[PDB]
């Protein structure tokens, strides 16, 4: 036969017939544990949504990760980009970066430079207007800004603008002197994000020659990753000699970070919920044991090892553990990706879109076997206090 | 007294002593764990509420107007036309710049605020929030800037330094290419909040229309009204007084999301610890099924002295009700300690583990405050017991309804 | 002379199918305020059931409890709880006392339950106290008493109200003559002079000789009827 | 002659010092296989807790109750359990069934403990239950059942497993005479076949008397042994 603590865990469980109260007063366990993993679902793949909208509007505009030379620029010819491949990077295109300060006519303000080889589409070529792509030709200074930073200063299609570099200052007998040029506006581009507050992109070549690079040298490579929550590791990978690895953490890393903070504190904040559903477990037993000592002992009088009533009774535990694990996962689920279509019958909170649902079975894994595991630790104390307990002190 | 204290004696008639005990523990560390949780985060907000009150809104400009196409030939006019708009604290004027601050061969663009001092010290509590200096005897013909203490760091400048300013100062003539540079004297560190100090210069406004080269006007007009909540129609009613020229910014736009998202955290907080006193009024639902099972033969005696139906109900809601009570007042004693002591609490476990909560220039506050409101501990302790006598109603009707010649029989 | 309450015909059956037995039948009782009528009969042989039966604890099969021709049984179980509690007192054989309550709480319970106010009820309780002979051990705990001492403190809790009917289901099986005889007499007064009416079912022969006109309730039967005269 | 069971110096304490009563106390047994042993006694005398340490439940303050060679002290839990399965056989005072499970499944636990195929331990239960006589009420409830059918099964469950040693502390307090004397004789029927002992506690000296072979034991001693041959 199976063996035997299955089968009496299993059949307490159920039964009682006679008045359908005692069962719901068993599951209660198990209805709260639901509760509490089907809020930590839910709010966990709201909170992801959320945090997947940001990073394809904040990380999803700017170079995801950055390889560059140890001392000065990098020269195409050492490292090509056949020869730069990785793990996890899906495209890799060179690229030149910088801090820069604008001055128009009427304001100032600082801005972050893109210098790009016009035949390569960027992520934001489909949001560029009034704007042919190829257009941006070395040397005549073709820079597309931002609508917020065109805004801000106020200038437009035909308005020229000095960018200069403090960094890239030289030493002469009237000071030190800032990089300086003029430079033409050839559009807008309009994506709608933080990022177009301060991103301009101009011809790859000018770019090198505005730092005051030897010609023909680029700032470095740019790699898009599939996954860039992950670039810590990444940052762990071996690389190609004489290079250094630079990654978005320098400048959006902190708010990211604080996003991330801020998810496991309501990480904790509900989970506490189910650590509460874990001590309702150990009252349950306590009433069980209770209810059952006067028939446990005629168990022990049969040949049930202590280590099997202990089994008998964590079987049980586990048994209410995984129903309410799965049923609230399952719940969690089907009330996840659908939550968009339920909520306008109701008042909304939001205005404008509903609400981003994005849903990682990762996490609904982890959820499960932390469940899983606080169930059992909840049922462990009561069986053991039942197995050691002596017969003759249970019946007097 | 009252009839009730039955049931008392059942709280007091407690035998079998070991692991029948530990449940009544398990069921006050749940709610205890909840609400001196929940408590916490109240209080956490309130603070936050609190903070945010004194610390931003009380420093920024509540109301802006600015003209569309020049600078004002009637700013007097229209202040003075708006000062006695209803519902309506003050009003002043500021000219708005934008330059290059360089030091120490740093440089920083930075926005720039020309204000009059004697009004500025009305129109908001700015000066009361420097760390040290003459924020009284800030004025005119001095080329003296107040820089906030971010940009001061990261500049690396210090008090009595030399800076120079560069505008562009565009002219229809040839003048606009080669902005104009200036040198300075800074004065004073502002230190108001993570966000706020890195953008904020402060300059004379006399001395601010001197640089310019511009004539006796100014930039924009900034208000302060009494009520802040409702600036946006009060804003836009005081720019429906004067010319139609103005264009009216309200701060509510930039920073009601901070009050929004204050009582969103609120109800989250406030749901799931209903949820938490839920799964507790479970457990309490759980042991009066065992009191009732255990003293079946005590409520039969009670019912043959010729009790009623509903006096036995009675007695298991005040039981049900009493254990409710006594977690609440066990998890509301630490609730009213922590709160207190919280920040200190906070700034242990900050040092305990090597991880900063809320710096870095993302929230507005770096600590984490805290402000007790006593009506919020009175609403989550009647949560509570609400809970609790929710839970103990149904046992209460299912031990009304056995009768005892019923199983005796 | 009876008027107050009337037994006729009192029948039950109290098992599951196949095995259901009739147990009683034709069951009915002539018991006159003012007279003293005691049951005897055999351990075991069905009368604890009827005699439950005539507290109103469970509702008949057949026969009635008829009060001056007003039903129990159309009338609501809260009406029962009045009955139970100020016009008749009821006796289990078992002690069925209260662990938790002192003496004073114990024996004033139905007061209590009488929802009167406390100076009345408690002067009522230290009445019944001192006519018991207990004072000396007042507000200690009743569980570590000897037995015959918790059974008359259930005997004087039935008796506070001074309910018209007191059915008292062998109140002197657990207790020694020394204190039976005591009661006999105080029961005597009570029943002479404020006139309860008593119906109390005793086995052994010698103490159910002990009443005056005496019935024998056999095996669900009324069989045995001995008068004086 | 006695080789199974072997009883040494017995003696028992469960509390603090003083107040400790010697229930047991040098108390040794001669238990013979094929014999019938009874005890008779009072309630109260020392009948129990006697009794159930032979079944190695508990562990005496001093002496030890070998089986074949193994003393309890040495031996393991797992062991002890494998001879409350295989070799001794008891009965409670109570009935003490299970009522999550129904009558066929219940007294065909320790089989299924035994942890054999099916299809011998349900052949072996039908048998049991023909010996019974309850082939109607096979998989009724046990709540929907009376006492002396459902004492009876547990007597049943007991013996299925064939114990060598059939332990019973009063079992028949629920059963009546007519139905005594068909188990007696199922008894007696195992005894002639199987030749299991039967150690049988009663209060009534008629059947401890019709043993074999009898001790008595009045305040914890061992005062009267007679045996037929």
Redesign the interface.
């Known amino acids: 036969?199976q063996p035997?603590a299955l089968?009496i865990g299993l059949?307490?469980m159920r039964?009682?017939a006679?008045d359908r109260?005692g069962r719901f007063?068993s599951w209660?366990?198990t209805?709260?544990i639901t509760?509490?993993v089907m809020?930590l679902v839910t709010v966990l793949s709201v909170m992801n949504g959320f945090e997947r909208e940001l990073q394809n509007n904040i990380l999803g505009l700017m170079p995801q990760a950055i390889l560059s030379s140890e001392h000065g620029s990098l020269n195409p010819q050492q490292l090509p980009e056949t020869a730069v491949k990785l793990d996890g990077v899906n495209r890799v295109a060179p690229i030149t970066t910088g801090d820069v300060?604008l001055?128009?006519?009427?304001?100032?303000?600082?801005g972050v430079m893109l210098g790009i080889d016009p035949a390569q589409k960027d992520p934001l070529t489909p949001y560029l207007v009034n704007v042919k792509q190829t257009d941006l030709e070395p040397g005549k200074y073709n820079v597309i800004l931002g609508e917020q930073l065109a805004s801000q200063l106020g200038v437009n299609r035909g308005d020229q603008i000095?960018v200069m570099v403090?960094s890239a200052?030289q030493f002469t007998p009237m000071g030190?002197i800032?990089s300086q040029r003029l430079f033409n506006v050839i559009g807008t581009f309009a994506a709608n994000s933080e990022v177009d507050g301060y991103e301009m992109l101009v011809n790859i070549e000018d770019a090198s020659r505005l730092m005051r690079y030897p010609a023909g040298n680029i700032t470095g490579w740019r790699l898009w990753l599939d996954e860039p929550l992950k670039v810590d590791s990444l940052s762990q990978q071996k690389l190609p000699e004489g290079s250094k690895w630079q990654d978005w953490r320098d400048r959006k890393g902190?708010?990211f970070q604080?996003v991330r903070?801020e998810k496991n504190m309501?990480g904790l904040?509900?989970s506490?919920?189910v650590?509460?559903?874990a001590?309702?477990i150990?009252?349950?037993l306590?009433?069980m044991?209770?209810?059952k000592q006067?028939?446990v002992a005629?168990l022990?009088?049969?040949?049930?090892?202590?280590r099997q009533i202990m089994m008998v009774f964590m079987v049980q535990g586990a048994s209410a553990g995984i129903i309410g694990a799965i049923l609230g996962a399952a719940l969690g689920a089907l009330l996840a990706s659908q939550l968009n279509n339920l909520m306008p019958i109701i008042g909304v909170?939001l205005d404008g879109a509903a609400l981003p649902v994005a849903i990682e079975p990762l996490q609904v894994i982890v959820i499960a076997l932390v469940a899983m595991a606080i169930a059992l630790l909840s049922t462990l104390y009561?069986s053991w206090?039942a197995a050691a307990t002596?017969?003759?002190e249970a019946?007097? | 007294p009252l009839s009730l204290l039955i049931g008392l004696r059942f709280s007091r008639g407690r035998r079998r002593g070991g692991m029948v005990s530990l449940i009544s523990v398990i069921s006050t560390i749940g709610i205890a764990l909840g609400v001196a949780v929940l408590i916490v985060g109240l209080s956490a907000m309130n603070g936050f509420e609190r903070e945010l009150n004194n610390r931003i809104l009380a420093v920024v400009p509540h109301g802006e107007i600015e003209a569309v196409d020049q600078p004002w030939t009637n700013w007097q006019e229209a202040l003075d036309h708006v000062q006695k708009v209803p519902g309506i604290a003050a009003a002043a004027p500021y000219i708005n710049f934008t330059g290059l601050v360089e030091s120490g061969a740093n440089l920083r663009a930075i926005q720039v605020k020309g204000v009059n001092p004697q009004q500025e010290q009305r129109l908001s509590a700015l000066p009361s929030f420097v760390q040290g200096d003459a924020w009284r005897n800030f004025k005119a013909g001095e080329q003296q800037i107040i820089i906030g203490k971010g940009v001061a760091d990261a500049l690396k400048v210090k008090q009595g330094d030399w800076v120079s300013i560069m505008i562009p100062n565009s002219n229809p003539e040839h003048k606009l290419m080669q902005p104009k540079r200036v040198r300075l004297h800074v004065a004073g560190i502002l230190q108001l909040s993570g966000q706020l100090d890195h953008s904020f210069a402060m300059i004379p406004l006399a001395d601010a229309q001197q640089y310019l080269d511009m004539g006796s006007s100014v930039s924009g007009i900034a208000l302060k009204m009494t009520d802040v909540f409702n600036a946006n129609k009060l804003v836009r009613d005081a720019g429906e007084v004067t010319n139609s020229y103005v264009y009216i910014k309200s701060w509510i736009g930039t920073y009601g999301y901070m009050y929004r998202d204050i009582q969103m955290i609120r109800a989250i907080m406030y749901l799931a610890m209903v949820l938490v006193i839920g799964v507790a009024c479970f457990n309490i639902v759980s042991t009066l099924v065992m009191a009732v099972k255990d003293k079946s033969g005590d409520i039969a005696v009670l019912r043959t002295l010729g009790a009623k139906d509903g006096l036995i109900r009675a007695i298991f809601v005040w039981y049900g009700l009493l254990a409710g009570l006594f977690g609440s007042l066990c998890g509301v004693i630490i609730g009213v300690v922590v709160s207190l002591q919280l920040t200190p609490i906070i700034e242990w476990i900050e040092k305990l583990i090597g991880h900063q909560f809320l710096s870095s220039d993302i929230y507005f506050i770096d600590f984490l405050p805290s402000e007790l409101h006593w009506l919020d501990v009175f609403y989550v302790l009647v949560t509570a017991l609400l809970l609790s006598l929710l839970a103990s109603w149904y046992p209460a009707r299912r031990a009304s309804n056995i009768d005892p010649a019923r199983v005796l029989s | 002379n009876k008027i107050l309450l009337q037994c006729d015909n009192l029948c039950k059956r109290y098992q599951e199918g196949s095995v259901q037995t009739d147990v009683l039948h034709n069951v009915s009782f002539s018991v006159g305020e003012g007279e003293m009528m005691a049951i005897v009969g055999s351990s075991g042989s069905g009368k604890s059931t009827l005699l439950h039966l005539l507290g109103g604890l469970d509702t008949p099969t057949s026969g009635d409890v008829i009060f001056n021709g007003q039903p129990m049984s159309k009338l609501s179980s809260a009406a029962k709880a009045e009955l139970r509690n100020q016009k008749l007192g009821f006796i289990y054989q078992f002690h069925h006392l209260l662990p938790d309550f002192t003496a004073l709480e114990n024996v004033a319970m139905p007061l209590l339950i009488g929802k009167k106010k406390p100076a009345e009820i408690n002067s009522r309780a230290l009445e019944m106290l001192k006519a018991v002979g207990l004072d000396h051990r007042a507000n200690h705990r009743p569980s570590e008493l000897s037995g015959g001492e918790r059974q008359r403190v259930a005997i004087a809790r039935a008796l506070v109200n001074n309910p018209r009917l007191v059915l008292a289901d062998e109140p002197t099986g657990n207790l020694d003559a020394r204190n039976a005889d005591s009661i006999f007499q105080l029961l005597g007064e009570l029943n002479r002079l404020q006139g309860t009416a008593f119906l109390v079912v005793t086995h052994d022969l010698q103490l159910a000789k002990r009443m005056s006109r005496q019935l024998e309730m056999r095996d669900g039967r009324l069989t045995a009827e001995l008068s004086l005269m």
């Open positions: 036969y035997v089968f059949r307490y039964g009682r006679a109260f007063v209660l366990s209805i709260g509760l509490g809020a300060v001055q128009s006519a009427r304001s100032v303000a600082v000095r403090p200052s030190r800032p902190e708010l604080a903070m309501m904040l509900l506490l919920i650590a509460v559903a001590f309702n150990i009252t349950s306590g009433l044991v209770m209810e006067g028939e005629i022990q009088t049969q040949g049930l090892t202590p909170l009561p206090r002596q017969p003759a019946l007097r």
